[PDB]
């Protein structure tokens, strides 16, 4: 039973992920050529999103903040892992018990869906099964950990969790917010994945404070991600994965070299041109650093460039991946803020270009200063046309994502789906076990975000029920009322947050609070989105938690403490673009 002991869920993720790609793609093709199908895809997409979690525990690849986990000894590192499993097991069991009761009640009173007509107890079997699988995978890893740690450690880990959860039941009533934030910080600091840290924080408040009936959690979990716009996350992630691993990044890098290889520092100008070209393919920063940093960094060092400068320019140059569409943070914002994704995408183009121009100019200045130079080659119209022809598959995707959205032809999630379908086609017919493994990786990666959004929706709901967005809004207005003085305060706050928190985690936590106040003083909701994303993209390359630095440092085996100094000038040039977009809303929103 080894195949079921390890790879039980993976076949379903592969089967489901392919389905929603085909279902949504077929829905789109017939729609354009010229309705119940969306209901089916949304039900399946919920199935893979929660089935894929059990995998993410056995791989132990859950996204989390490990700023102090790394600092802790090995012994304390193990204790942190047993605590994470217990905490994540408390959440998994609770959503299991409520999910069963919810199904039992739904059986008593049947209730069918609009289009499919399925009883609602059928599509909700994801909650009991998936949190049923999740709970066992936790039990396996917990069993393995206790073998690794021992009897003394295990009781230390368990007793610590007992004291952690004791106050919730000891006291009949405790204030909602202190418990909500107090626990969210603890789980975040200890090492629990952010998505889970939110869920347990919300779950703890419901218990002690009774903000919502406990039965709401399961219903919120399924309903919070029952929307079509959110489906653009897995589609874009799949499209990037099937193409990032392809090796077309080398074809772009050759094209970027052709354009900008002649100028002094032309190599570092080629790197930035590549990341910008690959920014219109991948919707992530670290996907861009890894997909390009793997190639350019060893090449730059060999040509003579300092490795640290090669690591720096690649980290910052890759942050453009989230600016130029596609990009996850915009999709996370468009869903969490209920803003227009078709407008956020076009919003970030101009800030993305300005950041690239800013870096290219600085690179030109640095190279000319240090005497660095590019390669020698007789590039001409013949060679340029040859390079364009080679990267054609890479350059075809931006047409689909932009033409579909900007042109008003397709919804953002429809255009995302066509991209993944295209990624598969070029992911096999231009390059089975590897293809099977990639599909698991895309679904595993998407589920890392959707589960975060579901747990955030429960979190955001408890905050709204406590009028937190107004409590913050009144304090800010009273302190100052000027729109400019306000946008400065937000932009600073996000900068401090970006050095400590993940981009997507911060977006979902903060958008529920910041969105109203900035709207009161007349900031466009979309404009605040571009500010938020651009302000968090700079968070990729800001220590200690550099979401892009870590990838580049690994590809170069550098030292972050030393790589941080090299990239500091690059941060400043990005902050210049940040202020320009914030306080000159005309140009960043030229299209949007």
């Amino acid at each position, epitope marked *: 039973l080894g195949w079921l002991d390890a790879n039980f869920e993976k076949p379903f993720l592969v089967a489901g992920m392919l389905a929603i790609i085909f279902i949504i793609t077929f829905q789109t093709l017939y729609r354009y050529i010229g309705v119940w199908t969306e209901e089916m895809a949304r039900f399946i997409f919920i199935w893979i999103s929660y089935l894929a979690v059990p995998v993410a525990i056995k791989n132990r690849s859950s996204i989390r903040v490990d700023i102090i986990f790394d600092r802790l000894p090995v012994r304390f590192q193990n204790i942190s892992w047993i605590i994470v499993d217990v905490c994540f097991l408390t959440l998994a069991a609770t959503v299991l018990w409520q999910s069963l009761d*919810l199904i039992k*009640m*739904q059986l008593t*009173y049947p*209730q069918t869906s609009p289009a499919l007509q399925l009883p*609602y107890y059928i599509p*909700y079997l994801v909650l009991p099964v998936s949190f049923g699988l999740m709970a066992v995978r936790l039990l396996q890893d917990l069993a393995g950990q206790v073998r690794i740690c021992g009897a003394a450690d295990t009781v230390i880990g368990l007793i610590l969790c007992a004291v952690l959860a004791a106050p919730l039941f000891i006291a009949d009533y405790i204030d909602p917010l202190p418990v909500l934030f107090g626990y969210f910080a603890l789980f975040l600091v200890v090492g629990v994945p952010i998505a889970i840290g939110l869920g347990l924080a919300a779950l703890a408040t419901i218990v002690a404070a009774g903000s919502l009936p406990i*039965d*709401y959690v*399961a*219903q*919120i979990a*399924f*309903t919070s991600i029952d929307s079509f716009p959110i489906m653009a996350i897995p589609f874009f992630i799949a499209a990037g994965v099937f193409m990032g691993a392809g090796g077309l990044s080398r074809r772009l890098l050759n094209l970027a070299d052709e354009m900008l290889g002649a100028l002094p520092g032309g190599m570092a100008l080629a790197t930035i041109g590549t990341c910008m070209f690959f920014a219109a393919i991948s919707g992530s920063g670290p996907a861009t650093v890894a997909a390009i940093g793997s190639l350019t960094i060893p090449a730059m060092v060999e040509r003579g460039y300092c490795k640290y400068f090669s690591a720096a320019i690649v980290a910052a140059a890759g942050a453009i991946g989230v600016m130029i569409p596609p990009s996850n943070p915009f999709v996370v914002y*468009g869903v969490s*803020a*209920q*803003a*227009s994704i078709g407008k956020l995408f076009m919003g970030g183009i101009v800030p993305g270009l300005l950041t690239g121009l800013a870096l290219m100019a600085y690179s030109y200045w640095y190279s000319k200063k240090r005497g660095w130079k590019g390669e020698v080659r007789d590039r001409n119209l013949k060679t340029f046309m040859h390079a364009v022809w080679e990267a054609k598959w890479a350059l075809m995707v931006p047409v689909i994502v932009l033409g579909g959205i900007y042109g008003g032809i397709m919804t953002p999630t429809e255009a995302a789906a066509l991209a993944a379908f295209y990624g598969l086609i070029i992911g096999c017919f231009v390059h089975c076990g590897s293809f099977y493994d990639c599909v698991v990786e895309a679904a595993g990666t998407s589920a890392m975000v959707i589960v975060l959004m579901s747990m955030a*929706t429960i979190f*955001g*709901n408890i905050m*709204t029920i406590e*009028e937190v*967005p*107004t409590t913050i*809004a*009144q304090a800010m207005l009273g302190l100052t009322t000027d729109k400019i003085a306000i946008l400065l305060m937000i932009n600073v706050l996000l900068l401090i947050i970006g050095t400590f928190m993940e981009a997507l985690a911060a977006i979902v936590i903060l958008t*529920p609070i910041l*969105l*109203p106040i900035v*709207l*009161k*003083v*007349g900031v466009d*909701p*979309v404009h605040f*989105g571009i500010i938020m994303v651009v302000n968090l993209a700079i968070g990729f390359v800001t220590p200690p938690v550099g979401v892009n630095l870590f990838v580049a440092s690994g590809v170069a085996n550098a030292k972050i403490e030393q790589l941080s100094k090299v990239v500091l000038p690059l941060i400043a040039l990005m902050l210049a673009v940040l202020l320009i977009t914030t306080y000159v809303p005309a140009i960043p929103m030229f299209f949007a």
Partner: nanobody, 112 residues
């Protein structure tokens, strides 16, 4: 056929509504759905209203506007200004429900 350019303003201790919308209850008919605008300015219209009525808002004054246009005798109903929160207030058997707060309404009569 001119435009009545309906405007509705909410008064209360609230800071700002997450959602706002319009419902029209024609005589001898049901309180149907006209239009709705999200906090981030996602506008959802009823099928008949698609492209005819534009809904906007002024977050500073806390006012929702329904720039009714190209009105016809097929549309002569009273109009109710509805506003509800960001998240559903109650859940029951795996569905989410909104508790809409309602305005008195303003007869919108159209002839020829």
């Amino acid at each position: 056929g001119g435009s009545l350019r309906l405007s509705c303003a909410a008064s209360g201790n609230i800071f700002l509504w997450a959602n706002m919308g319009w419902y029209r209850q024609a005589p001898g008919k049901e309180r149907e759905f006209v239009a709705s605008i999200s906090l981030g300015a996602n506008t959802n219209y009823a099928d008949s209203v698609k492209g005819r009525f534009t809904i906007s808002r002024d977050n500073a004054k806390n006012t929702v506007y329904l720039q009714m246009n190209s009105l016809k005798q097929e549309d002569t109903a009273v109009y109710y200004c509805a506003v509800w929160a960001r998240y559903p207030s109650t859940y029951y058997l795996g569905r989410g429900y909104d508790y809409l707060y309602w305005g008195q309404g303003t007869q919108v009569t159209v002839s020829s």
